[PDB]
Amino acid sequence: EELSVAQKQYVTAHGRQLVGQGATTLCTMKKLLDGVNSRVDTFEQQILTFVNNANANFRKISDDKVMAASLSASRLQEMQYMKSLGNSIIKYMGETGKRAKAAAAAASAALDEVLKWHCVDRTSSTPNANCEPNAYKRDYYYEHSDPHKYSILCNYKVVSSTTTQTTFSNMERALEIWNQVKPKPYHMRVMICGAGAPAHQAAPAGRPCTVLENWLWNYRVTAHLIAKLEKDATLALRVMRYSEKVLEGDKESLAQHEERRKAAEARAAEEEAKRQAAEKAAEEARKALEEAEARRVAAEEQAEARRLEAEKAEKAKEAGQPVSEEKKKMLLEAVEKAEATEKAAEKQAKDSRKAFEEAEEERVKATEDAEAAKEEKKDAEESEEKLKKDVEKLAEEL
Numbered sequence: 001e002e003l004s005v006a007q008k009q010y011v012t013a014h015g016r017q018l019v020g021q022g023a024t025t026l027c028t029m030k031k032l033l034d035g036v037n038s039r040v041d042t043f044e045q046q047i048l049t050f051v052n053n054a055n056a057n058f059r060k061i062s063d064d065k066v067m068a069a070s071l072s073a074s075r076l077q078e079m080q081y082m083k084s085l086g087n088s089i090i091k092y093m094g095e096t097g098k099r100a101k102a103a104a105a106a107a108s109a110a111l112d113e114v115l116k117w118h119c120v121d122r123t124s125s126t127p128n129a130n131c132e133p134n135a136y137k138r139d140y141y142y143e144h145s146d147p148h149k150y151s152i153l154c155n156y157k158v159v160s161s162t163t164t165q166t167t168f169s170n171m172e173r174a175l176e177i178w179n180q181v182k183p184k185p186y187h188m189r190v191m192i193c194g195a196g197a198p199a200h201q202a203a204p205a206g207r208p209c210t211v212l213e214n215w216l217w218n219y220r221v222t223a224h225l226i227a228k229l230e231k232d233a234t235l236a237l238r239v240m241r242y243s244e245k246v247l248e249g250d251k252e253s254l255a256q257h258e259e260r261r262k263a264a265e266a267r268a269a270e271e272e273a274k275r276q277a278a279e280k281a282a283e284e285a286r287k288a289l290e291e292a293e294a295r296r297v298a299a300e301e302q303a304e305a306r307r308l309e310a311e312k313a314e315k316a317k318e319a320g321q322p323v324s325e326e327k328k329k330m331l332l333e334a335v336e337k338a339e340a341t342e343k344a345a346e347k348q349a350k351d352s353r354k355a356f357e358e359a360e361e362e363r364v365k366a367t368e369d370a371e372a373a374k375e376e377k378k379d380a381e382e383s384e385e386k387l388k389k390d391v392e393k394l395a396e397e398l
Helices: 020-034 036-061 065-069 073-117 168-181 215-247 255-318 325-396
Strands: none
Touching (some): 020 073, 020 215, 036 215, 073 215, 168 215, 215 325
């Protein structure tokens, strides 16, 4: 056995087709890989900002004639360890970001080939037996919908969600859900699909075949390098936080440490209120897009019904027995009335998506800023309270 679905397709066990949610999970991975270039580019700038601030502090602690001579033997060692540790980040960060963008593109290219041609029989291109109808259904509005049908158009299936942000955690769960719902091969008769003629084990026409996974290796590499950037980015901030506490002479046991903390709470609450306001409002736009898409389907159903009734009259007309003039006028007027509502509903669902996408992005920026406030609050909560334990313990030994 030792079956490998990475480079071969197999007849799915129990006739298991690719379900609707299976395409959904695939499209989230495609959207996860797309944001890698944006994620890496914004990561490098944030890591570089930290290691520049910290090293500038180290160009003041050395340049300070009082701080250098009052340093201890043991603290200078780790201080130059921390400075050298952060430089290690910047030095090897460039090829980490180069290898992550390229690995994402190799997976994105391979996934797009799967999304475009898995359900499409390649014997008006027709569907094969691999997919349920849901798998290639335009879930959101798509003008110009025929030439490429039965291909899974991802940016008309899934929109920017919480789980569509390029992070290791989000990428980790997406792969697990895909393995949860993927079509699973048959493990008792090795039945290789694809007309490469394995001869002894060629799969006969008309059975569901599993999804090829050549992107799978590049997906893991992409996610692992994203994980390294997040880990490296947090390590860089610790170097900067370390440098400030060493550059600062550790003054104002609680005078300025409570002052920073009292202010830290103010920004933390304000940004959280700013974050929670845009968070709730983004969910309002989410309802208004589903509320508008549901009407789009209702109008498109109603519009399709009137033109079939009108067509049935024409077939009767060619069949000798015609319908009256008023009946002929009624059907065309009903179609016009049903087409007007149809074309106005899809316009409404076209704009509602623009509303959510803009409102969703404002959620992201609000959450990112509200997380920067949370760190500063927890930096002041540590620098002050841990210091407060030393002043309290002074009075204790008495």
